[PDB]
Write an enzyme that holds these catalytic residues in place. Structure first.
Site, PDB file in Angstrom:
ATOM      1  N   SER A 125      49.096  39.505  -2.893  1.00 52.62           N
ATOM      2  CA  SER A 125      49.942  40.564  -2.349  1.00 52.62           C
ATOM      3  C   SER A 125      49.933  40.767  -0.853  1.00 52.62           C
ATOM      4  CB  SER A 125      49.774  41.945  -3.162  1.00 52.62           C
ATOM      5  OG  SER A 125      48.792  42.653  -2.653  1.00 52.62           O
ATOM      6  N   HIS A 150      47.271  44.714   2.570  1.00 55.49           N
ATOM      7  CA  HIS A 150      48.987  44.962   2.466  1.00 55.49           C
ATOM      8  C   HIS A 150      49.313  45.242   3.986  1.00 55.49           C
ATOM      9  CE1 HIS A 150      49.078  46.479  -1.965  1.00 55.49           C
ATOM     10  NE2 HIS A 150      48.642  45.170  -1.644  1.00 55.49           N
TER      11      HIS A 150
END
Length: 180
Positions: A111, A162
């Protein structure tokens, strides 16, 4: 049609590592693929990238692969395989580095790379529309909800990964867009 070869090789590698994790256990695979927890391990160079291959449930892998296949497939289709590879290597290396500082070495998943590709496709499609990639407003929405959801642990997200991944993709797209 396409997905190109780098989109699929990454999908197969994540599936392979995930199957290995089901058979051997998470922790057993983690011990070998996680970012080094001990400086004596610092020359086990695969570990700066292999943390991206590990997922902790079917939902974890499906959700990352979805986004990977959608955004990575678009980058590789329009801009080629070498571009996807570079985005992936740099974002995996840098988002893992930042994640390890935020919370230490025990993390995994694509991610960080996903948020770099979100950053990249959005800023590149915005500043250089002729690239033929773009990120829809709807998806921009979800990305922003996804980041802030991690801030509040709605779960246990790699929040450093992230934001660092996002920064990485914005910066590469900005650089690629200057250039033409």
């Amino acid at each position: 049609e396409r997905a190109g070869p780098v989109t699929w090789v990454m999908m197969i590698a994540c599936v392979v590592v995930f199957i290995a994790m089901q058979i051997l256990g998470d922790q057993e695979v983690m011990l070998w693929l996680a970012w080094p927890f001990d400086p004596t391990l610092k020359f086990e160079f695969w570990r700066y990238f292999t943390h991206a291959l590990m997922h902790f449930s079917l939902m974890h892998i499906l959700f990352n692969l979805l986004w990977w296949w959608y955004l990575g497939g678009a980058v590789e289709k329009r801009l080629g395989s070498g571009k996807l590879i570079v985005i992936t290597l740099i974002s995996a290396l840098l988002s893992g580095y930042v994640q390890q500082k935020f919370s230490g070495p025990w993390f995994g998943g694509l991610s960080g790379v996903v948020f770099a590709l979100m950053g990249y496709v959005w800023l590149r499609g915005e500043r250089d529309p002729q690239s033929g990639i773009y990120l829809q407003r709807g998806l921009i929405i979800f990305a922003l909800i996804w980041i802030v959801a991690g801030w509040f642990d709605l779960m246990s997200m790699a929040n450093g990964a992230h934001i660092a991944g996002l920064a990485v993709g914005l910066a590469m797209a900005f650089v690629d867009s200057l250039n033409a």
